[PDB]
Coordinates of C-alpha atoms in Angstrom, one line a residue:
Chain A
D229 CA -21.0 3.9 -9.3
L230 CA -23.6 1.9 -7.3
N231 CA -26.5 3.7 -9.1
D232 CA -25.3 2.5 -12.5
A233 CA -25.0 -1.1 -11.2
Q234 CA -28.6 -0.9 -9.9
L235 CA -29.7 0.5 -13.3
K236 CA -28.1 -2.3 -15.3
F237 CA -29.3 -5.0 -13.0
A238 CA -32.9 -3.6 -13.4
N239 CA -32.3 -3.6 -17.1
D240 CA -31.2 -7.2 -17.2
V241 CA -34.2 -8.3 -15.1
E242 CA -36.6 -6.4 -17.4
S243 CA -34.9 -7.9 -20.5
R244 CA -35.2 -11.4 -19.0
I245 CA -38.9 -10.9 -18.4
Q246 CA -39.5 -9.5 -21.9
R247 CA -37.6 -12.3 -23.5
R248 CA -39.7 -14.9 -21.6
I249 CA -42.9 -13.2 -22.6
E250 CA -41.9 -12.9 -26.2
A251 CA -40.8 -16.5 -26.3
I252 CA -44.1 -17.8 -24.8
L253 CA -46.3 -15.6 -27.0
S254 CA -44.4 -16.0 -30.3
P255 CA -45.7 -19.5 -31.5
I256 CA -49.4 -18.6 -31.4
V257 CA -49.9 -15.0 -32.7
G258 CA -46.9 -15.1 -35.0
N259 CA -43.1 -14.6 -35.1
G260 CA -43.3 -10.8 -35.2
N261 CA -46.9 -9.9 -34.4
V262 CA -46.4 -9.1 -30.7
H263 CA -44.4 -6.6 -28.6
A264 CA -44.0 -6.2 -24.8
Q265 CA -42.4 -3.8 -22.4
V266 CA -41.6 -4.4 -18.7
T267 CA -40.7 -2.0 -15.9
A268 CA -39.7 -3.1 -12.4
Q269 CA -39.1 -1.6 -9.0
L270 CA -36.3 -3.0 -6.8
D271 CA -35.5 -2.7 -3.1
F272 CA -31.9 -1.8 -2.4
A273 CA -32.2 -1.1 1.4
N274 CA -30.4 -3.0 4.1
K275 CA -32.6 -4.6 6.7
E276 CA -32.2 -6.8 9.8
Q277 CA -34.7 -8.4 12.1
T278 CA -34.7 -10.3 15.4
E279 CA -37.9 -11.9 16.8
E280 CA -38.5 -13.4 20.2
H281 CA -41.6 -15.3 21.1
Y282 CA -42.9 -17.1 24.2
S283 CA -45.7 -19.7 24.7
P284 CA -48.5 -18.7 27.1
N285 CA -48.9 -20.8 30.3
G286 CA -52.2 -19.4 31.6
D287 CA -53.8 -22.8 31.7
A288 CA -52.7 -25.2 34.5
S289 CA -53.0 -28.2 32.1
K290 CA -50.1 -26.8 30.0
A291 CA -47.9 -25.1 32.5
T292 CA -44.5 -26.4 33.6
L293 CA -43.6 -26.0 37.3
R294 CA -40.2 -26.1 38.9
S295 CA -40.9 -25.5 42.6
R296 CA -44.2 -24.9 44.4
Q297 CA -45.1 -24.1 48.0
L298 CA -48.7 -24.3 49.3
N299 CA -49.8 -23.5 52.8
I300 CA -53.4 -24.0 54.0
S301 CA -54.9 -23.2 57.4
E302 CA -58.4 -23.3 58.7
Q303 CA -60.0 -22.7 62.2
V304 CA -63.6 -23.4 62.9
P355 CA -66.4 -17.9 63.8
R356 CA -64.6 -19.2 60.7
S357 CA -61.1 -18.4 59.7
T358 CA -59.3 -19.4 56.4
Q359 CA -55.8 -18.7 55.1
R360 CA -54.1 -19.8 51.9
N361 CA -50.6 -19.0 50.7
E362 CA -49.1 -20.1 47.4
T363 CA -45.8 -19.5 45.5
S364 CA -45.0 -20.9 42.0
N365 CA -42.0 -20.9 39.7
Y366 CA -42.4 -21.7 36.0
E367 CA -40.3 -22.9 33.0
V368 CA -41.3 -21.4 29.6
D369 CA -40.8 -22.2 26.0
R370 CA -39.1 -19.6 23.9
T371 CA -38.2 -19.1 20.2
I372 CA -35.6 -16.8 18.7
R373 CA -35.2 -16.0 15.0
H374 CA -32.6 -13.8 13.2
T375 CA -33.1 -12.6 9.6
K376 CA -31.0 -10.6 7.2
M377 CA -32.8 -9.6 4.0
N378 CA -31.4 -9.7 0.5
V379 CA -30.6 -6.6 -1.5
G380 CA -32.1 -6.4 -4.9
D381 CA -35.6 -7.9 -4.6
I382 CA -38.6 -7.1 -6.8
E383 CA -41.4 -5.0 -5.3
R384 CA -43.8 -4.3 -8.2
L385 CA -44.3 -5.2 -11.9
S386 CA -46.1 -3.4 -14.7
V387 CA -46.4 -5.1 -18.1
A388 CA -47.8 -3.8 -21.4
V389 CA -48.5 -6.0 -24.4
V390 CA -49.6 -5.1 -27.9
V391 CA -50.8 -7.7 -30.4
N392 CA -51.5 -7.4 -34.1
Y393 CA -54.7 -8.0 -36.0
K394 CA -55.3 -11.3 -37.9
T395 CA -54.8 -10.9 -41.6
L396 CA -56.2 -13.4 -44.1
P401 CA -57.5 -6.8 -41.0
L402 CA -59.7 -8.9 -38.7
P403 CA -59.8 -8.5 -34.9
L404 CA -58.9 -11.4 -32.7
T405 CA -61.6 -13.4 -30.9
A406 CA -62.3 -12.7 -27.2
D407 CA -61.3 -16.2 -26.2
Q408 CA -57.9 -15.8 -27.9
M409 CA -57.4 -12.5 -26.0
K410 CA -58.3 -14.3 -22.7
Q411 CA -55.8 -17.1 -23.5
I412 CA -53.1 -14.5 -24.4
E413 CA -53.7 -12.6 -21.1
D414 CA -53.5 -15.9 -19.1
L415 CA -50.2 -16.9 -20.8
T416 CA -48.8 -13.4 -20.1
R417 CA -49.9 -13.6 -16.5
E418 CA -48.1 -17.0 -16.2
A419 CA -45.0 -15.8 -17.9
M420 CA -44.6 -12.6 -15.9
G421 CA -45.0 -14.2 -12.5
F422 CA -48.1 -12.2 -11.5
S423 CA -48.6 -11.8 -7.7
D424 CA -51.7 -10.0 -6.4
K425 CA -50.0 -9.3 -3.0
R426 CA -47.2 -7.6 -4.8
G427 CA -49.6 -5.3 -6.7
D428 CA -48.6 -6.3 -10.2
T429 CA -50.4 -4.8 -13.1
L430 CA -50.9 -6.1 -16.7
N431 CA -52.5 -4.5 -19.8
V432 CA -52.9 -6.1 -23.2
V433 CA -54.1 -4.2 -26.3
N434 CA -55.0 -5.5 -29.7
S435 CA -54.6 -3.1 -32.6
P436 CA -53.5 -3.2 -36.2
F437 CA -49.8 -2.6 -36.7
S438 CA -48.4 0.3 -38.7
Chain B
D229 CA -18.8 17.1 -8.1
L230 CA -21.7 15.2 -6.5
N231 CA -24.3 17.6 -8.0
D232 CA -23.2 16.7 -11.6
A233 CA -23.4 13.0 -10.7
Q234 CA -26.9 13.5 -9.4
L235 CA -27.8 15.4 -12.6
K236 CA -26.5 12.8 -15.0
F237 CA -28.1 9.9 -13.0
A238 CA -31.4 11.7 -13.2
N239 CA -30.8 12.2 -17.0
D240 CA -30.2 8.5 -17.5
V241 CA -33.3 7.6 -15.6
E242 CA -35.4 10.0 -17.6
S243 CA -33.8 8.8 -20.9
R244 CA -34.6 5.1 -20.0
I245 CA -38.2 6.0 -19.2
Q246 CA -38.5 8.0 -22.5
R247 CA -37.0 5.1 -24.5
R248 CA -39.4 2.6 -23.0
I249 CA -42.4 4.9 -23.7
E250 CA -41.2 5.5 -27.3
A251 CA -40.6 1.8 -27.9
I252 CA -44.0 0.7 -26.6
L253 CA -45.9 3.5 -28.4
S254 CA -44.0 3.3 -31.7
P255 CA -45.7 0.2 -33.4
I256 CA -49.3 1.5 -33.2
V257 CA -49.3 5.2 -34.0
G258 CA -46.3 5.1 -36.3
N259 CA -42.5 5.2 -36.3
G260 CA -42.2 9.0 -35.9
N261 CA -45.7 10.2 -35.0
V262 CA -45.1 10.4 -31.2
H263 CA -42.9 12.3 -28.8
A264 CA -42.5 12.2 -25.0
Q265 CA -40.7 14.0 -22.2
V266 CA -40.1 12.8 -18.7
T267 CA -39.0 14.7 -15.6
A268 CA -38.1 12.9 -12.3
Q269 CA -37.4 13.9 -8.7
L270 CA -34.9 11.9 -6.6
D271 CA -34.1 11.5 -2.9
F272 CA -30.5 12.0 -2.1
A273 CA -30.7 12.1 1.7
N274 CA -29.2 9.7 4.2
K275 CA -31.7 8.0 6.5
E276 CA -31.6 5.3 9.2
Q277 CA -34.4 3.8 11.3
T278 CA -34.7 1.5 14.3
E279 CA -38.0 0.1 15.5
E280 CA -38.8 -1.8 18.7
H281 CA -42.2 -3.4 19.3
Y282 CA -43.8 -5.4 22.1
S283 CA -46.8 -7.7 22.2
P284 CA -49.5 -6.7 24.7
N285 CA -50.3 -9.1 27.5
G286 CA -53.4 -7.5 29.0
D287 CA -55.4 -10.7 28.6
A288 CA -54.7 -13.5 31.1
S289 CA -55.3 -16.2 28.4
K290 CA -52.2 -14.8 26.4
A291 CA -49.8 -13.8 29.2
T292 CA -46.6 -15.7 30.1
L293 CA -45.8 -15.8 33.8
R294 CA -42.5 -16.6 35.4
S295 CA -43.1 -16.4 39.2
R296 CA -46.4 -15.7 41.0
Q297 CA -47.3 -15.3 44.7
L298 CA -50.9 -15.2 45.9
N299 CA -51.9 -14.7 49.5
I300 CA -55.6 -14.9 50.6
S301 CA -57.1 -14.5 54.1
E302 CA -60.6 -14.3 55.3
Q303 CA -62.1 -14.1 58.8
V304 CA -65.9 -14.4 59.5
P355 CA -68.0 -8.8 61.1
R356 CA -66.3 -9.8 57.8
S357 CA -62.7 -9.3 56.9
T358 CA -61.0 -10.0 53.6
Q359 CA -57.4 -9.6 52.4
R360 CA -55.8 -10.5 49.1
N361 CA -52.2 -10.0 48.0
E362 CA -50.7 -10.8 44.6
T363 CA -47.4 -10.4 42.8
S364 CA -46.6 -11.3 39.2
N365 CA -43.6 -11.4 36.9
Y366 CA -44.0 -11.7 33.1
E367 CA -42.1 -12.6 30.0
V368 CA -42.8 -10.6 26.9
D369 CA -42.3 -11.0 23.1
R370 CA -40.3 -8.2 21.4
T371 CA -39.3 -7.4 17.8
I372 CA -36.4 -5.2 16.7
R373 CA -35.8 -4.0 13.2
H374 CA -33.0 -1.9 11.7
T375 CA -33.2 -0.2 8.3
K376 CA -30.8 1.8 6.2
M377 CA -32.4 3.5 3.2
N378 CA -31.0 3.7 -0.3
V379 CA -29.7 6.9 -1.9
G380 CA -31.2 7.8 -5.3
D381 CA -34.8 6.7 -5.1
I382 CA -37.6 8.1 -7.3
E383 CA -40.2 10.3 -5.5
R384 CA -42.5 11.7 -8.2
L385 CA -43.0 11.4 -12.0
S386 CA -44.5 13.8 -14.6
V387 CA -45.0 12.6 -18.2
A388 CA -46.1 14.5 -21.2
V389 CA -47.0 12.8 -24.5
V390 CA -47.9 14.3 -27.9
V391 CA -49.3 12.3 -30.7
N392 CA -49.9 13.2 -34.4
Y393 CA -53.1 13.2 -36.4
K394 CA -54.1 10.3 -38.7
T395 CA -53.5 11.1 -42.3
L396 CA -55.2 9.1 -45.1
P401 CA -55.7 15.4 -41.1
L402 CA -58.2 13.3 -39.2
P403 CA -58.3 13.2 -35.4
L404 CA -57.8 9.9 -33.6
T405 CA -60.8 8.1 -32.0
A406 CA -61.4 8.3 -28.3
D407 CA -60.9 4.6 -27.8
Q408 CA -57.4 4.9 -29.4
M409 CA -56.6 7.7 -27.1
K410 CA -57.7 5.7 -24.1
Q411 CA -55.6 2.7 -25.2
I412 CA -52.6 5.0 -25.7
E413 CA -53.0 6.5 -22.2
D414 CA -53.3 3.0 -20.7
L415 CA -50.1 1.9 -22.5
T416 CA -48.2 5.0 -21.4
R417 CA -49.5 4.4 -17.8
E418 CA -48.1 0.8 -17.9
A419 CA -44.8 1.9 -19.5
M420 CA -44.1 4.7 -17.0
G421 CA -44.8 2.7 -13.9
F422 CA -47.6 4.9 -12.6
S423 CA -48.1 4.9 -8.8
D424 CA -51.0 6.9 -7.3
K425 CA -49.4 6.8 -3.9
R426 CA -46.3 8.4 -5.4
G427 CA -48.3 11.3 -6.9
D428 CA -47.4 10.6 -10.5
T429 CA -49.0 12.7 -13.2
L430 CA -49.5 12.0 -16.9
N431 CA -50.9 14.1 -19.8
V432 CA -51.4 13.1 -23.4
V433 CA -52.3 15.5 -26.2
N434 CA -53.3 14.8 -29.8
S435 CA -52.5 17.6 -32.2
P436 CA -51.4 17.8 -35.9
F437 CA -47.6 18.0 -36.3
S438 CA -45.9 21.0 -37.8
Chain C
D229 CA -15.1 29.7 -5.1
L230 CA -18.2 28.0 -3.8
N231 CA -20.4 30.8 -5.0
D232 CA -19.4 30.3 -8.6
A233 CA -20.0 26.6 -8.3
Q234 CA -23.5 27.3 -7.0
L235 CA -24.1 29.7 -9.8
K236 CA -23.1 27.3 -12.6
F237 CA -25.0 24.4 -11.0
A238 CA -28.1 26.6 -11.0
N239 CA -27.4 27.6 -14.6
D240 CA -27.2 23.9 -15.7
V241 CA -30.5 23.1 -13.9
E242 CA -32.2 26.0 -15.6
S243 CA -30.7 25.1 -19.0
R244 CA -31.9 21.5 -18.6
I245 CA -35.5 22.6 -17.7
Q246 CA -35.4 25.1 -20.7
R247 CA -34.2 22.4 -23.1
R248 CA -36.9 20.0 -21.9
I249 CA -39.6 22.7 -22.4
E250 CA -38.3 23.6 -25.8
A251 CA -38.1 20.0 -26.9
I252 CA -41.7 19.2 -25.7
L253 CA -43.2 22.4 -27.2
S254 CA -41.3 22.4 -30.5
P255 CA -43.3 19.8 -32.6
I256 CA -46.7 21.5 -32.2
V257 CA -46.2 25.3 -32.5
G258 CA -43.2 25.1 -34.8
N259 CA -39.4 24.8 -34.8
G260 CA -38.7 28.4 -33.8
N261 CA -42.0 29.9 -32.8
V262 CA -41.5 29.4 -29.0
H263 CA -39.1 30.7 -26.3
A264 CA -38.9 30.0 -22.6
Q265 CA -36.9 31.2 -19.6
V266 CA -36.5 29.4 -16.2
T267 CA -35.2 30.8 -12.9
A268 CA -34.7 28.5 -9.9
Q269 CA -33.9 28.9 -6.2
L270 CA -31.7 26.3 -4.5
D271 CA -31.1 25.4 -0.8
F272 CA -27.4 25.2 0.1
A273 CA -27.7 24.9 3.9
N274 CA -26.6 22.0 6.0
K275 CA -29.3 20.3 8.1
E276 CA -29.5 17.3 10.4
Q277 CA -32.5 15.8 12.2
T278 CA -33.1 13.2 14.9
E279 CA -36.6 12.1 15.8
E280 CA -37.8 9.9 18.7
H281 CA -41.4 8.7 19.1
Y282 CA -43.2 6.5 21.6
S283 CA -46.5 4.6 21.4
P284 CA -49.1 5.6 24.0
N285 CA -50.2 2.9 26.5
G286 CA -53.2 4.6 28.1
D287 CA -55.5 1.8 27.3
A288 CA -55.2 -1.4 29.3
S289 CA -56.0 -3.5 26.3
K290 CA -52.8 -2.4 24.6
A291 CA -50.4 -2.0 27.5
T292 CA -47.4 -4.4 28.1
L293 CA -46.7 -5.1 31.7
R294 CA -43.5 -6.5 33.2
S295 CA -44.2 -6.7 37.0
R296 CA -47.4 -5.9 38.9
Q297 CA -48.3 -5.9 42.6
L298 CA -51.9 -5.5 43.8
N299 CA -53.0 -5.5 47.5
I300 CA -56.6 -5.4 48.5
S301 CA -58.1 -5.2 52.0
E302 CA -61.7 -4.8 53.2
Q303 CA -63.2 -4.8 56.7
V304 CA -67.0 -4.8 57.3
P355 CA -68.4 0.8 59.7
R356 CA -66.8 0.1 56.3
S357 CA -63.1 0.2 55.5
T358 CA -61.5 -0.3 52.1
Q359 CA -57.8 -0.1 51.0
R360 CA -56.3 -0.7 47.6
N361 CA -52.6 -0.5 46.6
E362 CA -51.2 -1.0 43.1
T363 CA -47.8 -0.8 41.4
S364 CA -47.1 -1.3 37.7
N365 CA -44.1 -1.4 35.4
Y366 CA -44.4 -1.1 31.6
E367 CA -42.6 -1.9 28.4
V368 CA -43.0 0.6 25.6
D369 CA -42.4 0.7 21.9
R370 CA -40.1 3.4 20.5
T371 CA -38.9 4.6 17.1
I372 CA -35.7 6.5 16.3
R373 CA -34.9 8.1 13.0
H374 CA -31.8 10.0 11.8
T375 CA -31.8 12.1 8.7
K376 CA -29.1 14.2 6.9
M377 CA -30.4 16.4 4.1
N378 CA -28.9 16.9 0.7
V379 CA -27.3 20.1 -0.4
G380 CA -28.5 21.7 -3.6
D381 CA -32.3 21.0 -3.7
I382 CA -34.8 23.0 -5.6
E383 CA -37.2 25.2 -3.5
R384 CA -39.2 27.2 -6.1
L385 CA -39.7 27.6 -9.8
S386 CA -40.8 30.4 -12.1
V387 CA -41.4 29.8 -15.8
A388 CA -42.2 32.3 -18.6
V389 CA -43.2 31.1 -22.1
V390 CA -43.8 33.2 -25.2
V391 CA -45.5 31.8 -28.3
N392 CA -45.9 33.2 -31.8
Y393 CA -49.0 33.9 -33.8
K394 CA -50.3 31.5 -36.4
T395 CA -49.5 32.7 -40.0
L396 CA -51.4 31.4 -43.0
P401 CA -51.2 37.0 -38.2
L402 CA -54.0 35.0 -36.5
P403 CA -54.2 34.4 -32.8
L404 CA -54.2 30.8 -31.5
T405 CA -57.3 29.2 -30.2
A406 CA -58.0 29.0 -26.5
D407 CA -57.9 25.2 -26.5
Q408 CA -54.4 25.3 -28.1
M409 CA -53.3 27.7 -25.3
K410 CA -54.7 25.4 -22.7
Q411 CA -52.9 22.4 -24.2
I412 CA -49.7 24.4 -24.3
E413 CA -50.0 25.4 -20.7
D414 CA -50.7 21.7 -19.7
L415 CA -47.7 20.5 -21.6
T416 CA -45.5 23.2 -20.0
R417 CA -46.8 22.3 -16.6
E418 CA -45.9 18.6 -17.2
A419 CA -42.5 19.5 -18.6
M420 CA -41.5 21.8 -15.7
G421 CA -42.5 19.5 -12.9
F422 CA -45.0 21.9 -11.4
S423 CA -45.6 21.4 -7.6
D424 CA -48.3 23.4 -5.8
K425 CA -46.7 22.7 -2.4
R426 CA -43.4 24.2 -3.7
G427 CA -45.1 27.4 -4.8
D428 CA -44.2 27.1 -8.5
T429 CA -45.5 29.7 -10.9
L430 CA -46.0 29.6 -14.7
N431 CA -47.0 32.3 -17.2
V432 CA -47.6 31.8 -20.9
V433 CA -48.2 34.7 -23.3
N434 CA -49.2 34.6 -27.0
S435 CA -48.0 37.6 -29.1
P436 CA -46.7 38.1 -32.6
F437 CA -43.0 37.9 -33.0
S438 CA -40.9 40.9 -34.1
Chain D
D229 CA -9.9 41.2 -0.4
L230 CA -13.2 39.7 0.7
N231 CA -15.1 42.9 -0.1
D232 CA -14.0 42.8 -3.8
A233 CA -15.2 39.2 -4.0
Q234 CA -18.6 40.1 -2.6
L235 CA -18.8 43.0 -5.1
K236 CA -18.0 40.8 -8.1
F237 CA -20.3 38.0 -7.0
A238 CA -23.1 40.6 -6.7
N239 CA -22.2 41.9 -10.1
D240 CA -22.4 38.4 -11.7
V241 CA -25.8 37.8 -10.0
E242 CA -27.1 41.1 -11.3
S243 CA -25.7 40.4 -14.8
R244 CA -27.3 37.0 -14.9
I245 CA -30.7 38.5 -14.0
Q246 CA -30.3 41.3 -16.5
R247 CA -29.4 38.8 -19.3
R248 CA -32.4 36.6 -18.4
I249 CA -34.8 39.6 -18.5
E250 CA -33.3 40.9 -21.8
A251 CA -33.5 37.5 -23.4
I252 CA -37.2 36.9 -22.4
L253 CA -38.3 40.5 -23.4
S254 CA -36.3 40.7 -26.7
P255 CA -38.6 38.7 -29.1
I256 CA -41.7 40.7 -28.5
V257 CA -40.8 44.4 -28.3
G258 CA -37.8 44.2 -30.5
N259 CA -34.1 43.4 -30.6
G260 CA -32.9 46.7 -29.1
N261 CA -36.1 48.4 -27.8
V262 CA -35.7 47.4 -24.2
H263 CA -33.2 48.1 -21.4
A264 CA -33.1 46.8 -17.8
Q265 CA -31.1 47.3 -14.6
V266 CA -31.0 45.1 -11.5
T267 CA -29.6 45.8 -8.0
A268 CA -29.4 43.1 -5.4
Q269 CA -28.7 42.8 -1.6
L270 CA -26.8 39.8 -0.3
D271 CA -26.4 38.3 3.2
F272 CA -22.8 37.6 4.1
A273 CA -23.2 36.8 7.8
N274 CA -22.5 33.5 9.5
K275 CA -25.4 31.9 11.3
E276 CA -26.1 28.7 13.2
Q277 CA -29.2 27.3 14.8
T278 CA -30.2 24.5 17.1
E279 CA -33.9 23.7 17.8
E280 CA -35.3 21.2 20.4
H281 CA -39.0 20.4 20.6
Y282 CA -41.2 18.2 22.7
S283 CA -44.7 16.7 22.3
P284 CA -47.2 17.7 25.0
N285 CA -48.7 14.8 27.0
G286 CA -51.4 16.7 28.9
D287 CA -54.1 14.3 27.7
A288 CA -54.1 10.8 29.3
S289 CA -55.2 9.2 26.0
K290 CA -51.8 10.2 24.4
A291 CA -49.4 9.9 27.4
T292 CA -46.8 7.1 27.7
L293 CA -46.3 5.8 31.2
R294 CA -43.3 3.8 32.5
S295 CA -44.1 3.2 36.2
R296 CA -47.2 4.2 38.1
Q297 CA -48.1 3.8 41.8
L298 CA -51.7 4.4 43.1
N299 CA -52.8 4.1 46.7
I300 CA -56.5 4.5 47.7
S301 CA -58.0 4.4 51.2
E302 CA -61.5 5.0 52.5
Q303 CA -63.1 4.7 55.9
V304 CA -66.8 5.1 56.5
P355 CA -67.7 10.5 59.6
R356 CA -66.1 10.0 56.2
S357 CA -62.4 9.8 55.4
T358 CA -60.7 9.6 52.0
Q359 CA -57.1 9.5 50.9
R360 CA -55.6 9.2 47.5
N361 CA -51.9 9.0 46.5
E362 CA -50.4 8.8 43.0
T363 CA -47.0 8.9 41.4
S364 CA -46.3 8.8 37.6
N365 CA -43.3 8.6 35.3
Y366 CA -43.5 9.4 31.6
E367 CA -41.7 8.9 28.4
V368 CA -41.7 11.8 25.9
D369 CA -41.1 12.3 22.2
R370 CA -38.4 14.9 21.3
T371 CA -37.0 16.4 18.1
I372 CA -33.6 18.0 17.6
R373 CA -32.6 20.0 14.5
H374 CA -29.2 21.6 13.6
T375 CA -28.9 24.1 10.8
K376 CA -25.9 26.0 9.3
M377 CA -27.0 28.7 6.9
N378 CA -25.3 29.5 3.5
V379 CA -23.3 32.7 2.9
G380 CA -24.3 34.8 -0.1
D381 CA -28.1 34.5 -0.2
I382 CA -30.3 37.1 -1.9
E383 CA -32.4 39.3 0.5
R384 CA -34.1 41.9 -1.8
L385 CA -34.5 42.8 -5.5
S386 CA -35.2 46.0 -7.3
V387 CA -35.8 46.0 -11.0
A388 CA -36.3 48.9 -13.5
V389 CA -37.3 48.3 -17.1
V390 CA -37.6 50.9 -19.9
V391 CA -39.4 50.1 -23.2
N392 CA -39.5 52.1 -26.4
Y393 CA -42.5 53.4 -28.3
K394 CA -44.0 51.6 -31.3
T395 CA -43.0 53.1 -34.6
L396 CA -45.0 52.4 -37.8
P401 CA -44.2 57.3 -32.3
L402 CA -47.3 55.5 -30.9
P403 CA -47.6 54.4 -27.3
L404 CA -48.0 50.7 -26.5
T405 CA -51.4 49.3 -25.5
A406 CA -52.2 48.7 -21.8
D407 CA -52.5 44.9 -22.4
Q408 CA -49.1 44.8 -23.9
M409 CA -47.7 46.6 -20.8
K410 CA -49.4 44.2 -18.5
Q411 CA -48.0 41.2 -20.4
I412 CA -44.5 42.8 -20.3
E413 CA -44.8 43.3 -16.5
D414 CA -46.0 39.7 -16.0
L415 CA -43.0 38.4 -18.1
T416 CA -40.6 40.5 -16.2
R417 CA -42.1 39.3 -12.9
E418 CA -41.6 35.7 -14.0
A419 CA -38.1 36.3 -15.2
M420 CA -36.8 38.1 -12.1
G421 CA -38.2 35.6 -9.6
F422 CA -40.4 38.0 -7.8
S423 CA -41.2 37.1 -4.1
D424 CA -43.6 39.2 -2.1
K425 CA -42.2 37.9 1.2
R426 CA -38.7 39.0 0.1
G427 CA -40.0 42.6 -0.5
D428 CA -39.0 42.7 -4.2
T429 CA -40.0 45.7 -6.2
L430 CA -40.4 46.2 -10.0
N431 CA -41.1 49.3 -12.1
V432 CA -41.6 49.4 -15.9
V433 CA -41.8 52.7 -17.9
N434 CA -42.7 53.2 -21.5
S435 CA -41.1 56.2 -23.2
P436 CA -39.7 57.1 -26.6
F437 CA -36.0 56.5 -27.0
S438 CA -33.6 59.3 -27.7

């Protein structure tokens, strides 16, 4: 039930990415001289989060007092006594978050391109441009651990 | 009942991976010169998790006080007395997680490719490219302990 | 009742593994020059687990205090007195797990392959490749104590 | 009533094992040059188990404190007094298990093979291979105390 829904949602995401890559790479190399395959991992867990934070008031120049009592005594044999009581007001921040179900976690993309026929291999600059365009199309994110591989080989 | 559902879901996942691998590897080696088989392990247990965390306040420059009392006395034979009471406010974080049922745990992939007929073995670079493409297609993850094996041998 | 269901589920698992092995090994050795048999052990017990964990706070640089009282006295014949009371906040983690019924525990696989007829035994490298392919197909796990045996002998 | 059900379940298990052994051993020695018999012991008792475990906190670097009081006094004739009170938080694990009824406890297998007719006894290597294949087919487990015996003798 739910598993089939997860499967077809993943299939649609992969198909969308593949269609974008094919559309962006089609004009340069040729109409049918490029193929791509995309596999994706999705998060289907339910998560909630609550965060509470307070601002430190260790410095007297930034503290906010509400009521203070200070008693000082001194007899002069030397005697000294000092009593102090303080009450503070503090700044606080509260945040509540409920995550979304069905977010992408990692991407792996493989691209295969054909040789140039006038059976001549493509130039290195053309390969670099193709890799850059594929990186743009697939939404590469280094923090997400995405991986891309492009191979140039004659078609059969 | 449930066991059959787990079996057919695993079968569909394996078939999807096999279809992706065959589609990506077909254009280079040939239409019918490659075969692959995929076996997968799935987690069907129910898990829940609750995490609570607190920020340390051992440093006075980062602590948040609410009420403090400090008494100091000194007679001068030397006598010294110091009393102190403190109350703190702390930052806390709470997270609740419910895992998904039916997640992949490990992958094992076997690929067999045919010889090049003009009965000539394929070049090492071609084998490396094929392994890289299969690694991309199968979503290899070293942390998940995935394993891949590719063998080149003439077909019967 | 339940025993027959366990038996036929085990039979289907074994048949699936056998079909995968036969499909992966068929193209190389031949259409009908290989046979395999698979036996599996399954866990049908009901298990539950609850885990509680706490983070140690033995180091003052990582502790989280809530209220602290510290009294110090000293007369100078030398007298010294020190009183201290502390209250802490701790991080805790709780996990609940319910296991799945019908999980594989161990696997034993036997494979028999035929001689090469032009009555010539197969090369050692071919045997190693066949063992590797069978290991990939059967989902071998050393931690699970799986066992595989492959024998090459002329067919009758 | 129940006894007959136990008997026929044991009979089906034995028949399944016998069929597997006959199928795996048939191609090599011959279609009808091998016979096997299997006897099994099954556990039909009802068992339950509950386990509770705690993590030791004898080392101060791994303990988790909640509230601590420490009083120290010293007069200098030398007098010393030290009072200490501690309260701890501990990690605990609870597991509940209900075993399955109808599990195998021990296996005994006897196999008889025929002579090679061109009335010639089989080679020792062939016997070793047959024993290994039978061991694989019957799911031998040394911890379970399984026992196997194979005899080569001319048929009558």
